[PDB]
Amino acid sequence: FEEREKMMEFYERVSGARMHAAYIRPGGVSLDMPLGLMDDIYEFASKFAERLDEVEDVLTTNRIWVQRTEDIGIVTAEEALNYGFSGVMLRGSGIKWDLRKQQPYDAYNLVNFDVPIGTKGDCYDRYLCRVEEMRQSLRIIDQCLNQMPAGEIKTD
Amino acid sequence: LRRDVSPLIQRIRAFLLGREHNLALRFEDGLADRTQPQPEIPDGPSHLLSANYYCQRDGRREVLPPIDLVEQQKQLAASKLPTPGKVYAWD
Amino acid sequence: AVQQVRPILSVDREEARKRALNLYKAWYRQIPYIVMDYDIPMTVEQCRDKLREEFVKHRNVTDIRVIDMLVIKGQMELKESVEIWKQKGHIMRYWKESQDPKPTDFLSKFIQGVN
Amino acid sequence: PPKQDLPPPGGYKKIPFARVPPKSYFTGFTTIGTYVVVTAVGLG
Amino acid sequence: EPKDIVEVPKGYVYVNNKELSMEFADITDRAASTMFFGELLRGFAVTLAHIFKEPATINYPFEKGPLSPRFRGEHALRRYPSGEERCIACKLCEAICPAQAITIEAEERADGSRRTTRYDIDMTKCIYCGFCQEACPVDAIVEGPNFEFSTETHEELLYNKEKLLCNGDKWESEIASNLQADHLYR
Amino acid sequence: IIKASTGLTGLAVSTNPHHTLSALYGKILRAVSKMPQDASYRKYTEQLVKQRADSVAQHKDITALEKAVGCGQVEELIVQAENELILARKMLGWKPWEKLVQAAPAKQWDWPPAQIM
Amino acid sequence: RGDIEKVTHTGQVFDKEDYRNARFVNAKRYVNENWGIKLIEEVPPKECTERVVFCDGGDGPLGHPKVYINLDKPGNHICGYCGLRFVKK
Amino acid sequence: DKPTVRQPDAVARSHLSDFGRYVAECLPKYVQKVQLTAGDELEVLIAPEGVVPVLQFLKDHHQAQFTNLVDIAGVDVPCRKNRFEVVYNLLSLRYNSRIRVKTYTDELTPLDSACEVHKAANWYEREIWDMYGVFFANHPDLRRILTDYGFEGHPQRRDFPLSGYVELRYDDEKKRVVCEPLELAQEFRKFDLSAPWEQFPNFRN
Amino acid sequence: QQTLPVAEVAQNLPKKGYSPFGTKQSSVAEWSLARLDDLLNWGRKGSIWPLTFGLACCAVEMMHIAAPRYDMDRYGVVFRASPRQADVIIVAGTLTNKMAPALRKVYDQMPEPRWVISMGSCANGGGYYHYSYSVVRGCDRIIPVDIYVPGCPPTAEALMYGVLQLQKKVKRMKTLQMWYRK
Numbered sequence A: 001f002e003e004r005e006k007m008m009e010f011y012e013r014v015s016g017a018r019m020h021a022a023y024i025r026p027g028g029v030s031l032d033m034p035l036g037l038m039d040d041i042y043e044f045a046s047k048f049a050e051r052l053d054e055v056e057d058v059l060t061t062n063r064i065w066v067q068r069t070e071d072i073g074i075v076t077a078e079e080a081l082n083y084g085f086s087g088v089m090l091r092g093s094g095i096k097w098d099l100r101k102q103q104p105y106d107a108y109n110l111v112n113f114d115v116p117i118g119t120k121g122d123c124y125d126r127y128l129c130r131v132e133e134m135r136q137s138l139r140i141i142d143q144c145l146n147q148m149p150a151g152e153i154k155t156d
Numbered sequence B: 001l002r003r004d005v006s007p008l009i010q011r012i013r014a015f016l017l018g019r020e021h022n023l024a025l026r027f028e029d030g031l032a033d034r035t036q037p038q039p040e041i042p043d044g045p046s047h048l049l050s051a052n053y054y055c056q057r058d059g060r061r062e063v064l065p066p067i068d069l070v071e072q073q074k075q076l077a078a079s080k081l082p083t084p085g086k087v088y089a090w091d
Numbered sequence C: 001a002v003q004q005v006r007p008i009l010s011v012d013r014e015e016a017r018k019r020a021l022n023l024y025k026a027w028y029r030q031i032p033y034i035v036m037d038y039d040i041p042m043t044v045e046q047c048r049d050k051l052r053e054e055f056v057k058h059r060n061v062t063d064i065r066v067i068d069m070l071v072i073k074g075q076m077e078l079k080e081s082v083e084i085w086k087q088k089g090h091i092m093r094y095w096k097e098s099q100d101p102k103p104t105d106f107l108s109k110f111i112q113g114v115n
Numbered sequence D: 001p002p003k004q005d006l007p008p009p010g011g012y013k014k015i016p017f018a019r020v021p022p023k024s025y026f027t028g029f030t031t032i033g034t035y036v037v038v039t040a041v042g043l044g
Numbered sequence E: 001e002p003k004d005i006v007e008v009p010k011g012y013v014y015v016n017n018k019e020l021s022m023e024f025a026d027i028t029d030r031a032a033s034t035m036f037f038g039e040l041l042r043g044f045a046v047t048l049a050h051i052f053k054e055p056a057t058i059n060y061p062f063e064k065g066p067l068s069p070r071f072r073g074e075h076a077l078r079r080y081p082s083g084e085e086r087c088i089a090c091k092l093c094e095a096i097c098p099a100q101a102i103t104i105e106a107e108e109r110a111d112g113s114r115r116t117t118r119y120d121i122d123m124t125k126c127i128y129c130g131f132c133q134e135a136c137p138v139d140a141i142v143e144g145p146n147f148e149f150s151t152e153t154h155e156e157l158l159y160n161k162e163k164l165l166c167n168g169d170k171w172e173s174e175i176a177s178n179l180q181a182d183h184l185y186r
Numbered sequence F: 001i002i003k004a005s006t007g008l009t010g011l012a013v014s015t016n017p018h019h020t021l022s023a024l025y026g027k028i029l030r031a032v033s034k035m036p037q038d039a040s041y042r043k044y045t046e047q048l049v050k051q052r053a054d055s056v057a058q059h060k061d062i063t064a065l066e067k068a069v070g071c072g073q074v075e076e077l078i079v080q081a082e083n084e085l086i087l088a089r090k091m092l093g094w095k096p097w098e099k100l101v102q103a104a105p106a107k108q109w110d111w112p113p114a115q116i117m
Numbered sequence G: 001r002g003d004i005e006k007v008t009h010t011g012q013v014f015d016k017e018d019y020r021n022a023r024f025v026n027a028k029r030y031v032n033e034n035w036g037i038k039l040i041e042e043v044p045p046k047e048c049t050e051r052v053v054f055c056d057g058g059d060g061p062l063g064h065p066k067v068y069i070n071l072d073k074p075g076n077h078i079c080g081y082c083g084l085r086f087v088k089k
Numbered sequence H: 001d002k003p004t005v006r007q008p009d010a011v012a013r014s015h016l017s018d019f020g021r022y023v024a025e026c027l028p029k030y031v032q033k034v035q036l037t038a039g040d041e042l043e044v045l046i047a048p049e050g051v052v053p054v055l056q057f058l059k060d061h062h063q064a065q066f067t068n069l070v071d072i073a074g075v076d077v078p079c080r081k082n083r084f085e086v087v088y089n090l091l092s093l094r095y096n097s098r099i100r101v102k103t104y105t106d107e108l109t110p111l112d113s114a115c116e117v118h119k120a121a122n123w124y125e126r127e128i129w130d131m132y133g134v135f136f137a138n139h140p141d142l143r144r145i146l147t148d149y150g151f152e153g154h155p156q157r158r159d160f161p162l163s164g165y166v167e168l169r170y171d172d173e174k175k176r177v178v179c180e181p182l183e184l185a186q187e188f189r190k191f192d193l194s195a196p197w198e199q200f201p202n203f204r205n
Numbered sequence I: 001q002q003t004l005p006v007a008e009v010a011q012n013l014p015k016k017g018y019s020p021f022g023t024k025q026s027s028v029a030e031w032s033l034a035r036l037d038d039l040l041n042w043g044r045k046g047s048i049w050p051l052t053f054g055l056a057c058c059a060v061e062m063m064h065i066a067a068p069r070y071d072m073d074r075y076g077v078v079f080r081a082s083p084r085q086a087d088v089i090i091v092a093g094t095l096t097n098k099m100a101p102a103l104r105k106v107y108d109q110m111p112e113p114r115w116v117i118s119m120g121s122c123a124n125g126g127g128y129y130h131y132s133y134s135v136v137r138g139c140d141r142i143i144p145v146d147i148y149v150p151g152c153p154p155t156a157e158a159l160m161y162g163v164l165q166l167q168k169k170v171k172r173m174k175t176l177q178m179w180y181r182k
C-alpha cells in the first residue's frame, strides 16, 4: 500500500482527485497529462519489480501460505463456464480467456503481453495469476511509456 | 546526498535481502520539477479551417435502425455452416 | 373481456383460497416464535389481530393472479420470519408504531394543514 | 522544449518485470552435514 | 530444470505448471528446506532487512504530502481583480452538478448587473468532482486547495454564499496560482 | 502415447476418446432420425455430426483428430457431443419446427417507444 | 454583537422578533465585508475613442468571454459580465 | 479518411448475419425476429414461451456454444402492452462472440427460469424479481436480493418514484430504527432536458 | 470571523499552554480536579481505538492512514475488531436501509465514552445517492456524530485532520470539573 499510495498520488497528479478521478470520458480523456509525469511513473515502474520481488519472497514460498491456499476452493472449468465466471476465476481454472486479447479495445492490440493461466483452480493458482498480471501490467506500462504520439487528447 | 543508513547497515540489509537494494523512497533529485514551462496542446485532425464540413464528420447521424436479417435476405434474394465468429481454442 | 395467460401456481379461485388459508395457518404457527425471539413490544394476541387486519385489507381483491402474487409475497415474508433474516425494526413496521395518527374530520384537517 | 508531455528521444531502458531469485547459499547435503558436524562438536 | 506438464503456447504464461523433480538432489534440497525452515528463514531475513529501511511516514501536520495544481477540494467563489464577484448567475454549474448540491436563486441587482442572491452548496451532497469548475464560463466557482475543513456540526457543512465568498477571499492566492498553472490543460 | 494433462481442471484425460465420440455421434443420429425431414435443425445436425464422424473415423491419432476437427481438445469434443445429445433429446419434446406460438403484439419492439406515430 | 443585525449585500437581515436569531447565540453570523457593488463603482470608467470596444475580463483566457460594446449612445456603457464601465467622449 | 467516425468490422457483420439467419432458420417457433444492431451485436427477439429452450439451444448446438451467460438485464417500458422486457446476454468462448436474447413479460405473466441451463441466473433473475417484480417459475430460490427485508414494491419499475415512499430514522421511545413517510429536506429538482428540435432523421421511420 | 494574528501581535501574546482549562482556578479542589481531568483526557485523546467497519470506497482511504505514508499508529490510533474494544466508529461509506439497524446495534454495543467520525459525503448527508430510495440521508439521523470529515474521498491528510480534531475535542472534554460544578 506504500506503492498503492504512490499510484493514487499519480492519479491526483493527472486528474486532481486521489481516487475518484472522473478522468476517462466519452470521447477521449478530460485533460492532458501534466509535464514530468513520465519520469515519476518510470521511476515507480523501475522500483516496483524489486518491491514485488520482496513481497513474493515473503509470501509465495512459505509453507503456511501454501497450506492455507493450495487444494482449497477448487472450481472445475465446466462449473466456471456454467456459473458465468469471468476473468481470473476463469483464468485460474485453466481456461485461456482474456478480454484484452480476444476482443481488443482502446489500443491493446498495438501493445504486447502475456496472459497468465492457472492449472489447479485453487487459491494459490489465482494468487500467482494475479502476481503475473501485475508483472505483465508493468510490461504494458513499459511499452506505453516507450511509445505515445503527439496530438490531441479528445475527439473533435 | 540522500538520507540513508551508514553502509555497514546497508551491506547488512543487502545481505539479508538476498539481492541488491534500490531505494523505494522517492527523492527530489529523482523526480521532475514541480514548476514546468507552460505547454501548448497541439490541434487535432479537424481544426483546419478550410477543408472540413461537419456533414462528412457527423458520426451521430450515420447510425441506422437495426436491420431485420430475414427481411434483408428476403429483399436481397428476390459449404460450411454459419458460425458466430472465428474459432478460438481456449483448450 | 377475455384473455389467455399463463397461470401462477393455481388454475382456479379455490386453489388460491386454499393457498391463502395455508398462509394464515403458517403465519399463526409462526407468530408465537416471532414474539419470543424478535424482542418486540407486542403481545401474541395483538400480533394475531394485526395478521387478521393484514388479511382483511386484502380480502377485497378478486383476480386470481393478484391473489397468488399476494400468496407468493406472504410466503416470502414467512420465509424471512422462519429464519430470522431481519431485525426488530422491520417486524414492527406492520403496526406503524412511530407514525402519529392523523384526524379524518374536515375541520381538524382544515386547522392542521393542507394534506 | 517539451510543448507536450512526451517521452525523450532514444527511448527508455527496459523496465524489469521478471522475478529474480534471492541469493541461495545452502545445499541440502551441506545443510545436513553442517548440522551433523555442529551437533557432534556440541555433544563433545 | 523441472519439466513442464503442459506445453505453453506463444504469448501465454502457465503458473504452477512445473513438475516436481523426483531426483535425489532436489528431494534432499526440499527436505532440508522443510525440516530446517529455509523459506521461513528467508522471509525472516527479508523482514529483518526491511526493519533497517527508512520509514515513509511524514510528520503531519508539520510535513504534508505531495499534491497537484489540479487538486479538487473546497468549493470557492472567485472575484475579479476589480473587486466585483465573478459569478453571473447562469446556473450552468447547478445544471451539471450531478448530485444537485448547488442551489442558485437570482434577480437583477440595483445597478442592472446579472448577479446571484442565493448560492448554496450542500457540501454533504458534493462529491468534489470539478464539474462546476469546468462548466463555469467566467471561472467563478473553483475547487480550492483547502481540505482541512472538517466540522463538528452538520450545519456548518452546508455552505452559504457568504461562506463561499469568504473562501474565495481567503484562498485567493493559491487559487490564482493554480489557475495560472493549469488553464491551458483545460 | 498419452496426454499428461489437459491444462484445464475438472476434465481428466480420456482412455478411449474415439469410441466415446462415435457412440455419442450414433446416439445423436438416433435422436435426430425421429425429427421430421422438413426441419432445418435435423439437416444441420446431420451435416455436423456426419462431418465429425468422418473426422473421427478417418484419423486414428488423438492430436491429429484434434487438429483435423479444429474445434479444440478431444475431451471438449466429448463435452460438446454430450451437450448436443442432451439438446437432441430435448428438442423432440420442445417441438421447434412448427409455426410461431405467439404473434407480435402491437408496438412491442418499437424503439423509441414513447412516440405517437 | 453587531453581526446578527448586520445586512448582507442581498438585503437580508433577520428581525428582532424572529426565532431564527436563536441559531446565532453559539455561532457567529457570516456577512461578507467586501460588497461587489461598492468595489465595482470604485473603479473609474474607461475613456475610449473607437465606436465599439471589446472586453475579456482583463486576464485573457482567465477572464470572461470576449464581448463587444457599442459606444455611439452617450453615457456609461456597462459590461454585463465584469461590470467595467466604458465611455466615449 | 474519417478519423472521428468509428470504423465497424465487416467480417464480424457477415458472421453475425449468417449466424442470425441460421438461428432464425433453426427455431421457427420461438424466434420472433432476428436483428443486427449498430456496433455488430445480434439481438434475437423471442417469444416468452421460448425463454428456456432457445438458450438451451444456444448452450448446446455445435455452432452455438454460448457457455457464459454474463448478465440478464430487465428494461421497464410502461407504454407497451407487455410491460417489461428481459435481455439475456450470452458470451461464446469457442467462436469468440456475444448474443442478446430479448423477451417480453407482463407484470403477472411468468418466465420459465434458465437455472436448468445457466446457474448464474440463479441469482440474476432474483434481481429481476426484486427490481421489477416478474415471477420466475421453477426457481430453486426466489427471494428479494438487493432491497430491504420489509421493503414493499419494486424499485426500478418506472411507476416507482426515485426517492421511494418511506424513510428510516432512529426512535428512542421504541428504541428502534423506525419507518416514516418520506419528506425530503430539499426536493429533487427535476430538470427538463427534453430535446425541442430533433437531431436524428433516420429514427423517425 | 477572526484571522490568525500578525507576528508582532503573536509575539505580544504569551504561550497558550497544554491545558485548555487554564492554569489556576482559585481553588485547590478545582485545580486538583482540573489536573485529574487533564490526565484523563491525555489518556483518552491518546490512543483512541477506531472500529473495523468499512461500508464503502471511503474505507479504501481509511487504509491510507494505515499505509506507511501517514501511519495512524504513530498517534496511538489502532484498529480493533470488536465494538466493545473501541472508542471510535468511523462511519465511512453509504449507509443504506439494510444497514440502519446494523449501524445502530454496533454503535449501541460500543461502550461509553463514544465519539463517531463521519467520513465521506454518503455518511455526512447521503451525497451522490441522497435522492435514492434505499440510502439513509446521512448517519446523523440514526447515531450521534461528533466529527464530520467532509471530502467524498477525503485525503488521508484530511482524514487525520478529522482524527486530530477529535483528539482536540477529547482534550477539551470535561467531566470532573462538571461534576464539581453540578
Ligand SMILES: CCCCCCCCCCCCCCCCCC(=O)OC[C@H](COP(=O)([O-])OCC[N+](C)(C)C)OC(=O)CCCCCCCCCCCCCCCCC
Residues within 6 Å of the ligand: A063, D032, D035, D036, E034, E035, E036, E037, E040, E044
Ligand atoms: C536469530 C534467529 C532468527 C530466526 C528466528 C526464528 C526461528 C525459525 C522459526 C521458528 C518457528 C516459527 C513459527 C512456527 C512455524 C511452524 C512451521 C511448520 O512447522 O510448518 C509445518 C511444515 C509442514 O511440512 P510441509 O510444509 O513440507 O508440508 C508438506 C508435508 N505434510 C503435509 C505431509 C506435512 O513443516 C514441518 O513440519 C517441518 C518439520 C518441523 C520440525 C523439524 C524436524 C527436524 C527433524 C530432525 C532432522 C534430522 C536431520 C538429519 C539427521 C541425521 C542423523 C544421522
Ligand SMILES: CCCCCCCCCCCCCC
Residues within 6 Å of the ligand: D036, D039, D040, D043, D044
Ligand atoms: C550425530 C553425532 C554422533 C556422535 C555423537 C557423540 C560424539 C561424541 C562421543 C563421545 C566421544 C568421547 C571422546 C573421549
Ligand code: SF4
Residues within 6 Å of the ligand: E075, E093, E096, E097, E098, E099, E101, E102, E121, E125, E126, E127, E128, E129, E130, E131, E132, E133
Ligand atoms: S465539485 Fe461537483 S459535486 Fe461539488 S459542487 Fe462542483 S459540480 Fe457539484
Ligand code: SF4
Residues within 6 Å of the ligand: E086, E087, E088, E089, E090, E091, E092, E093, E094, E104, E135, E136, E137, E138, E139, E140, E141
Ligand atoms: S457556472 Fe459560474 S457564473 Fe454560472 S451560475 Fe455557476 S458559478 Fe455562477
Ligand code: SF4
Residues within 6 Å of the ligand: E127, I056, I057, I058, I059, I092, I093, I094, I119, I120, I121, I122, I123, I127, I128, I151, I152, I153, I154
Ligand atoms: S463519500 Fe464518496 S468515496 Fe465515500 S463512500 Fe460515498 S461515494 Fe465513496
Ligand SMILES: [Zn+2]
Residues within 6 Å of the ligand: G055, G056, G057, G064, G079, G080, G081, G082, G083, G084
Ligand atoms: Zn467585461
